[PDB]
Amino acid sequence: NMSFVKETVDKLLKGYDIRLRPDFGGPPVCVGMNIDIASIDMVSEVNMDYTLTMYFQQYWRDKRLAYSGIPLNLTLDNRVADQLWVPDTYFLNDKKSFVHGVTVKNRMIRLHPDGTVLYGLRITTTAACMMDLRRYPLDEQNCTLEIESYGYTTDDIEFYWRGGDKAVTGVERIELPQFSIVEHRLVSRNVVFATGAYPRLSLSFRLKRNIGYFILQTYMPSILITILSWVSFWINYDASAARVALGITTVLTMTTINTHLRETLPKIPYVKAIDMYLMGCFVFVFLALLEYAFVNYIFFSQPARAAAIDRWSRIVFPFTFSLFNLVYWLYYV
Amino acid sequence: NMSFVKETVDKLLKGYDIRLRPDFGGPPVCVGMNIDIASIDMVSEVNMDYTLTMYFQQYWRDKRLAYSGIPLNLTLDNRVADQLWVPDTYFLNDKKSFVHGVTVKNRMIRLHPDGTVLYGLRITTTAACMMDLRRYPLDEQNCTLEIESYGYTTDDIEFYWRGGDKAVTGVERIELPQFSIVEHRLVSRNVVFATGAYPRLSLSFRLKRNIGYFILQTYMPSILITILSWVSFWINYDASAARVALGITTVLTMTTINTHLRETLPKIPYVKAIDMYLMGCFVFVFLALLEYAFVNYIFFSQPARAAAIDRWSRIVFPFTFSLFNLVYWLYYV
Amino acid sequence: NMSFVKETVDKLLKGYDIRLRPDFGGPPVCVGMNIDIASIDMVSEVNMDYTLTMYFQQYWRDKRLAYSGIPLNLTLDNRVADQLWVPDTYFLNDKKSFVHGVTVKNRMIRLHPDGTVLYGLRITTTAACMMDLRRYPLDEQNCTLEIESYGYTTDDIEFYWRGGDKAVTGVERIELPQFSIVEHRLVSRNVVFATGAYPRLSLSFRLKRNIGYFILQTYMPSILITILSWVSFWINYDASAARVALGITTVLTMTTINTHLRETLPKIPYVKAIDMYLMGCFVFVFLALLEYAFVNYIFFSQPARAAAIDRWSRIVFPFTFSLFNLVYWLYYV
Amino acid sequence: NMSFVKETVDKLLKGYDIRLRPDFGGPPVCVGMNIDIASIDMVSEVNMDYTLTMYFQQYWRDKRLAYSGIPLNLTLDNRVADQLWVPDTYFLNDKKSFVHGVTVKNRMIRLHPDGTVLYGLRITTTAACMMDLRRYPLDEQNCTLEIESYGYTTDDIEFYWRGGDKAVTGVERIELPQFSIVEHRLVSRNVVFATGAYPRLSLSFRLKRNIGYFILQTYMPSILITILSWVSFWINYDASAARVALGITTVLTMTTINTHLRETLPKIPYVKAIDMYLMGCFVFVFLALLEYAFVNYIFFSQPARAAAIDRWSRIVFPFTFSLFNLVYWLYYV
Amino acid sequence: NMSFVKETVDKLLKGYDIRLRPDFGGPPVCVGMNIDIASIDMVSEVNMDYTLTMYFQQYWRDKRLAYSGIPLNLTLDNRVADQLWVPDTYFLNDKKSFVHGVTVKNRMIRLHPDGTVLYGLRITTTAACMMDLRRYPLDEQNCTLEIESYGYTTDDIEFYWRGGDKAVTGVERIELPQFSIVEHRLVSRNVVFATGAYPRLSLSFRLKRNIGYFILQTYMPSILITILSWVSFWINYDASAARVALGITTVLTMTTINTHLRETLPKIPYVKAIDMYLMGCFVFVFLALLEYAFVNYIFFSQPARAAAIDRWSRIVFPFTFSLFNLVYWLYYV
Ligand SMILES: *[C@@H]1O[C@H](CO)[C@@H](O[C@@H]2O[C@H](CO)[C@@H](O[C@@H]3O[C@H](CO[C@H]4O[C@H](CO)[C@@H](O)[C@H](O)[C@@H]4O)[C@@H](O)[C@H](O[C@H]4O[C@H](CO)[C@@H](O)[C@H](O)[C@@H]4O)[C@@H]3O)[C@H](O)[C@H]2NC(C)=O)[C@H](O)[C@H]1NC(C)=O
Ligand SMILES: *[C@@H]1O[C@H](CO)[C@@H](O[C@@H]2O[C@H](CO)[C@@H](O[C@@H]3O[C@H](CO[C@H]4O[C@H](CO)[C@@H](O)[C@H](O)[C@@H]4O)[C@@H](O)[C@H](O[C@H]4O[C@H](CO)[C@@H](O)[C@H](O)[C@@H]4O)[C@@H]3O)[C@H](O)[C@H]2NC(C)=O)[C@H](O)[C@H]1NC(C)=O
Ligand SMILES: *[C@@H]1O[C@H](CO)[C@@H](O[C@@H]2O[C@H](CO)[C@@H](O[C@@H]3O[C@H](CO[C@H]4O[C@H](CO)[C@@H](O)[C@H](O)[C@@H]4O)[C@@H](O)[C@H](O[C@H]4O[C@H](CO)[C@@H](O)[C@H](O)[C@@H]4O)[C@@H]3O)[C@H](O)[C@H]2NC(C)=O)[C@H](O)[C@H]1NC(C)=O
Ligand SMILES: *[C@@H]1O[C@H](CO)[C@@H](O[C@@H]2O[C@H](CO)[C@@H](O[C@@H]3O[C@H](CO[C@H]4O[C@H](CO)[C@@H](O)[C@H](O)[C@@H]4O)[C@@H](O)[C@H](O[C@H]4O[C@H](CO)[C@@H](O)[C@H](O)[C@@H]4O)[C@@H]3O)[C@H](O)[C@H]2NC(C)=O)[C@H](O)[C@H]1NC(C)=O
Numbered sequence A, B, C, D, E: 001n002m003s004f005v006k007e008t009v010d011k012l013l014k015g016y017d018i019r020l021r022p023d024f025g026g027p028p029v030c031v032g033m034n035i036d037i038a039s040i041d042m043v044s045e046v047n048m049d050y051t052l053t054m055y056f057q058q059y060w061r062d063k064r065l066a067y068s069g070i071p072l073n074l075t076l077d078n079r080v081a082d083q084l085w086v087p088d089t090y091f092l093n094d095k096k097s098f099v100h101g102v103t104v105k106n107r108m109i110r111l112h113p114d115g116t117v118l119y120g121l122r123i124t125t126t127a128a129c130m131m132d133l134r135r136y137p138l139d140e141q142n143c144t145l146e147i148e149s150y151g152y153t154t155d156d157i158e159f160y161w162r163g164g165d166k167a168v169t170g171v172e173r174i175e176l177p178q179f180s181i182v183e184h185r186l187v188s189r190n191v192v193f194a195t196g197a198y199p200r201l202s203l204s205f206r207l208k209r210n211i212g213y214f215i216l217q218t219y220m221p222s223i224l225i226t227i228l229s230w231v232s233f234w235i236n237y238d239a240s241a242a243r244v245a246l247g248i249t250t251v252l253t254m255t256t257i258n259t260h261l262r263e264t265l266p267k268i269p270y271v272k273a274i275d276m277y278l279m280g281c282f283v284f285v286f287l288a289l290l291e292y293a294f295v296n297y298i299f300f301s302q303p304a305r306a307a308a309i310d311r312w313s314r315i316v317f318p319f320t321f322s323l324f325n326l327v328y329w330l331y332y333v
């Protein structure tokens, strides 16, 4: 009977003060939370933030909304949520979050006979994640979503994960093009500020970055250019022009590769591992050119010593570069 | 008689409760749906999403809105839609969507004497499509648009296509630049979540990326540079300058092509077939240059051995390149 | 008497029903439309759309608003437009449009003694224009703005241009940095959909691109680089290093030019005219380098043959390039 | 007495008709405008528009709001501006303007005992400024802001700058990194349209561009490269490789500079002064290389003629470049 | 008893007039402001602005809201903030600011028994901060946040930091990668405009840029290229091709590095210190090439003088560059 249900809803909402929390002046209202992660849209190191779309649901108990005589759970229209009390839950570290509004506001209100209220939203947020990219791209990020009550202290509200360790779902279905979610954690605690103690929930992901693309697109050209520089040591004895032309081509190619690659890398202004590796390759080709210059300078007066120096460099350069490569791949793994 | 129509409408809306679905507590309301796709703006591989503009239409029946004495269809102003009940339909896999509002909100409400309601919106949505670019650019994508009620379960609402396979129209007129609509499919089903069973409609497009410019511009340069690296072998000593020029040209052109195609392609992190093809061609030409360097170094010592190495390279390099190309092509096509 | 005018307006708006169109259940209400174009902000080929700012004016006759005793055209505050029926006019091919709202909403309501209503808005609309860049940058586009009633069919409303071909003004004052408006047309007709017949207005512009910037930026440097690559023919063959360096550097310059210019071009899936010209220049310079390689290979055997080949090249390359330029410029113009 | 002030304000607003302008049916209302420019955020040549943040104040007299018994100016809350008549003032040439809304809407209403109303807003407008970049980067631009009534005509409203030439303040404190505000002018007039005459105010700035950055980073590298190209003439003509490499690498460096400058400089579909200068330098280096080619071709038969041509080139090329620079700098300054 | 609290609140708001400030026509209302800074999202030199997120809390006393019988602080729902009077506080140097509204408007209202009101917001604002980038990338910037009453003068409202110097917290926790916060200052004063005197609060940060990234990616390549241009000196002057090619290769590499760095570095329209350093390095390599040109011109007639010139240059160029670098690093540090 629609008229009877309308009468019940009007009776519930009449004399109902939306400005007062449930059990005002009494025990805090326990609010449980569920997060169904639809998808992690993207992760950006330039802005150091990740975009996250989720179904965020809050469960609590408002005795003023308890009804009797109806053996049903009333799934009301979303607009009635504007006439109820809802927790002032906000995301601590978000930068731009919104609730989808097509074709209507993605909002669900479900009343229960015992006064229990379920309130669901579909939120696309952009949470800030500070990233330690000193080991980029061989890095590992820990990005968290923080949930807190904005106004009410722990004396008026409490947050708990509804469902224990399985309160957050959908993480296993996330397809991140570059990262792999190694682990996710749920944390509940109380934080302290000048006004008092606030409840706090935290959903943490550990993202591990794939390195195949960097290996097959970033390091390999530099290694090949270094080998091409090494080729110079086995070019004639008096090729004062062809050998220096090969070195010139090597240096110009190294500069072009570094410039274009840094263009194809995030513009974050601090030293990274790939920057160190490219600097090392540049220093190595520069040292090869310096060795050629010194050999050419001493070639006319002491040809035997020049040839000996060239032969010794033929071994020293690959060995020193391999030592540097080993210490680099062991320092960053 | 506008006065009589206005009185009838006022009687219809007097006592109407938008917080209660039609036939509340009884059978679920069957909501039929039509989509008329105006156009698809773009299918971005970088963000893995596609923009779609459509004339979404919902058809249902609310017996509270049935009117008598007017043997016509009441095409009311869109604002009356705020005073009625509308389903909480939302697109499950959208990242941003809006209803156009110029000059007025693009919205149509039509009432029939038997309580039938037709509700039209003009919606532009950026729906997420997780592409698979392993076989890029010869891959075939499948991008879907999902439609699902938010709050009401199957006990309160049911979805179906109004017109069978003719429910969605305008697909054949989609002017996609880089894709072609191979086939569009309409699916209806139910999905069980922790909160119950919900209806689901799906509109899926299969897109075959046009080979075209990709074949005509990407693989051919690499093949030609490999052919040049081959023809660099049939060089005697007196034409050594020409061989040096050919080798340097091959290396520089390969590097420039690699950088250009890694800068002017959708910046997806993970590797793909084209990347492996380009790296293989680079490796082949680099190894050809290394072979020339070894031949030049050992030419003075044992010219017969150097000539034998040159001839064996002439025999082997095209054969190995052809084997690599065939295994790559049958591994991806 | 301001109070008397207030009483008259209140009497006009007392009992007025916005949800019902004028002449409801009778002849369709004729609406005459004027457009005063302010400027065309941009015409993006990347997004294939143009931004257009205009004053959109609608003219109809709602006899429910007819008043007597005040021989003046009542210019009312724009907010009263929220209390009147206005046509659900929308733009068929827009993507993102809005009405400026600073300092107030750019909206104008003017009532006339015979019930005539004039309703003006200032609209900035991004209309999609699916271009044809096969002849880029010598193309001639045709971009249209489509105006249609959303909910009401031709039985309820009938659009027409108020003033004939003079219904659209401000075309001559449009300042397009790149294009030049050749012609504009106004079309009025009816279009049939499954929901009935709808009025349709179309405002079409034909835009002709200006090629001077592309002439100086691209077409001249490519020609100069090709002519410079032709220099190697006059250089004596015995100076192998000079010709090798010239060919390699011309190839590298052409590669850099092509890469930068393509990166400054959209990713449409077909080859434009400028791409054809750049590819032709690249082919010419690469062929000159290969011709030098062939001459340096065969000069040891038959020096007279090599000299004859060079003397033939000095005529063939300029003649072939002149023929290529002639066919390219005649084909596209 | 707060209650007495509340009663007076309510009596002022009781029976107030916001739909009618003050003194309706009589003399037009006089609106005096002040602008206090906080900053000019940016100037963009790509979009040809400038961002402008201002305090915009309007002064008029509505005798319906006159009150007695309170010898004080009533600074009311901004929300009361939604209950008062305000002029429909808009900016004729803006594209995206808004009123700031943190913490509250930046808006001020001040009522005077004689009924005078002062209405202040904080507006950030992106105004469209057409620019003549024929003399970029040596150009001087003129950017205007147009203020006009939308609905009311000269028979209903009249604009005048309040304070004469001191109406607009804050101009001297504007800090444009690239421009310098030479002058600003205030103009008041009437514009005729099909709907009658409308008041119009215009605040115009004349901005002169700073050229130090363009001298350091743009002209100087080109001049240095052109000078470096002349090194070829002071090298012995038998060293074919050295001079060929010099000419071709100068051409390559000039191409790199030109392309990267075009990428960095704002996009424009026409020819600028800087482009003319770059093309001139390119022509000079191209002619230097061509002259060297002529010398290398004719040196064997007539070494005396080759030496004479080299001496004439040494005399002419610096002289011709100096003359070209002198005429270029005299024409554009 | 929640009904008692509801009655108390209704009595508080019975007849409350939001349009009137507390003690209207009396002493000015003291507003104490606290700021809890969460993070600084970015600091931009292209736009000269920084993004700041903060908990902004205002403290004042409204006697109209004083209540008795409830010995507790009433933390109300944020929506009640629309039913009270709040200061028209705004930020004087902001460009785009908003209050986060997920899952609700991040806003807090707390009423104290003595009528004291605490009103908190969570605000993200893009505050303009003009920068003196002459010493970039070794500069120290000063960015200020200005807080002022928009409509009320010092006769009606007074701003003061609440808690003394401890009014702003969270500064030490700001994680800026590129910059490093040195000192933050709080200033309180009154400014005088044409209308009257307005209160003003200012929060100033002094940021110091970090130069390690610039040193290891922007200065070292130039230093290495200059050292290579030096090593060009030790080649005997007879070899024209080698020295000429090395000098011009250094010039071309310097130009490419400069252009790609200007692309990667911020695009500000005026001169910095890095630009002067790059111009100095370019001048050094240019002078090295010119010196070799002079030596190659005079080597045949004056071999002793040419040898002496080379020997002297081998010490002069390193010494001159060392002096230039010492001057540069002492001037800017
Ligand atoms: C990314 O980085 C963040 C930190 O920046 C990590 O978050 C931390 O996660 C750990 C768990 O892995 C948290 O440690 C746990 O804190 C709980 C809360 O402590 C508060 O409340 C208790 C009372 O309930 C107080 O006693 C305490 O002082 C705090 O006020 C504890 O309840 C947990 O205790 C668990 O272990 C102990 C033994 O050590 C047992 O006795 C307990 O029963 C229980 O099992 C625990 O200490 C830590 O607080 C988090 N920090 C923050 C800032 O959130 C993320 O985990 C990381 N990401 C990933 C993927 O790891
Ligand atoms: C892009 O990729 C998506 C998948 O990711 C494809 O979507 C699938 O489309 C197929 C059809 O092409 C769907 O298969 C159909 O499912 C219907 C629903 O079945 C569900 O419900 C029933 C109970 O009602 C369950 O028993 C069942 O397990 C499912 O949960 C079926 O009714 C269909 O059956 C049809 O065929 C059978 C014979 O095979 C007949 O007996 C039936 O009468 C009927 O004709 C059918 O099986 C599939 O469910 C879709 N997947 C998803 C996840 O929705 C898109 O098609 C693809 N894009 C393109 C262009 O192809
Ligand atoms: C950019 O491209 C668009 C098309 O994509 C062009 O728009 C077309 O413009 C032409 C006119 O130049 C339009 O053709 C005209 O259509 C009118 C409307 O037809 C409807 O109404 C009539 C009855 O009035 C019906 O019979 C008909 O079936 C339609 O329902 C016609 O009235 C016009 O008639 C012309 O020809 C007849 C002879 O056949 C003459 O007697 C008339 O006097 C008149 O000359 C005409 O047919 C066409 O419809 C437009 N296309 C679309 C899709 O609307 C733009 O012009 C182009 N841009 C530029 C700048 O040219
Ligand atoms: C950027 O470029 C714009 C133009 O595109 C410049 O704007 C022009 O500014 C000049 C002033 O510098 C304007 O000229 C003045 O116009 C006034 C208004 O005239 C109108 O209204 C009067 C009635 O009030 C009518 O009679 C008249 O026909 C117009 O309809 C005049 O009052 C001014 O007259 C003054 O000078 C004359 C002599 O020239 C005297 O005889 C008068 O007594 C009086 O002293 C004057 O003519 C011009 O109108 C503006 N253009 C436009 C389109 O409005 C900007 O100045 C420029 N930017 C900068 C920084 O300079």
Ligand SMILES: *[C@@H]1O[C@H](CO)[C@@H](O[C@@H]2O[C@H](CO)[C@@H](O[C@@H]3O[C@H](CO[C@H]4O[C@H](CO)[C@@H](O)[C@H](O)[C@@H]4O)[C@@H](O)[C@H](O[C@H]4O[C@H](CO)[C@@H](O)[C@H](O)[C@@H]4O)[C@@H]3O)[C@H](O)[C@H]2NC(C)=O)[C@H](O)[C@H]1NC(C)=O
Residues within 6 Å of the ligand: E142, E143, E144, E183, E184, E185, E187, E188, E189, E190, E202, E204, E205, E206
């Ligand atoms: C970034 O740049 C801004 C400026 O753009 C700097 O802001 C300035 O900060 C200084 C303090 O470091 C301010 O100077 C202070 O002004 C106060 C206000 O003076 C007015 O009001 C008093 C009465 O209260 C009048 O007497 C006076 O005439 C003014 O009308 C003073 O009260 C302060 O005095 C304090 O210091 C002095 C010693 O310097 C003591 O003798 C006093 O007893 C007292 O302790 C002081 O003079 C200045 O006004 C600010 N400028 C602006 C425009 O706000 C930032 O500091 C800078 N960033 C950083 C990190 O430094």
Ligand SMILES: *[C@@H]1O[C@H](CO)[C@@H](O[C@@H]2O[C@H](CO)[C@@H](O)[C@H](O)[C@H]2NC(C)=O)[C@H](O)[C@H]1NC(C)=O
Residues within 6 Å of the ligand: A072, A073, A112
């Ligand atoms: C209405 O809500 C109640 C409470 O959530 C539902 O009761 C659940 O019923 C399922 C079995 O159907 C049990 O497994 C759960 O444990 C019950 N919940 C609790 C808290 O005991 C009830 O099913 C719902 N009814 C409808 C029609 O939605």
Ligand SMILES: *[C@@H]1O[C@H](CO)[C@@H](O[C@@H]2O[C@H](CO)[C@@H](O)[C@H](O)[C@H]2NC(C)=O)[C@H](O)[C@H]1NC(C)=O
Residues within 6 Å of the ligand: B071, B072, B073, B112
């Ligand atoms: C009101 O709308 C209904 C539904 O579109 C119209 O009924 C249709 O009439 C056509 C013939 O004109 C039939 O082919 C359809 O099958 C009918 N559909 C239904 C659902 O009945 C009806 O004609 C309209 N009213 C008027 C006066 O035209």
Ligand SMILES: *[C@@H]1O[C@H](CO)[C@@H](O)[C@H](O)[C@H]1NC(C)=O
Residues within 6 Å of the ligand: E001, E002, E003, E004, E005, E007
């Ligand atoms: C709460 O206080 C109100 C107002 O005094 C009173 O009417 C009501 O009866 C009280 N409720 C209880 C349970 O005492």
Ligand SMILES: NCCc1c[nH]cn1
Residues within 6 Å of the ligand: B036, B055, B120, C148, C149, C150, C151, C193, C195, C198
């Ligand atoms: N243009 C009227 C609405 C419509 C057309 N097609 C589908 N819906």
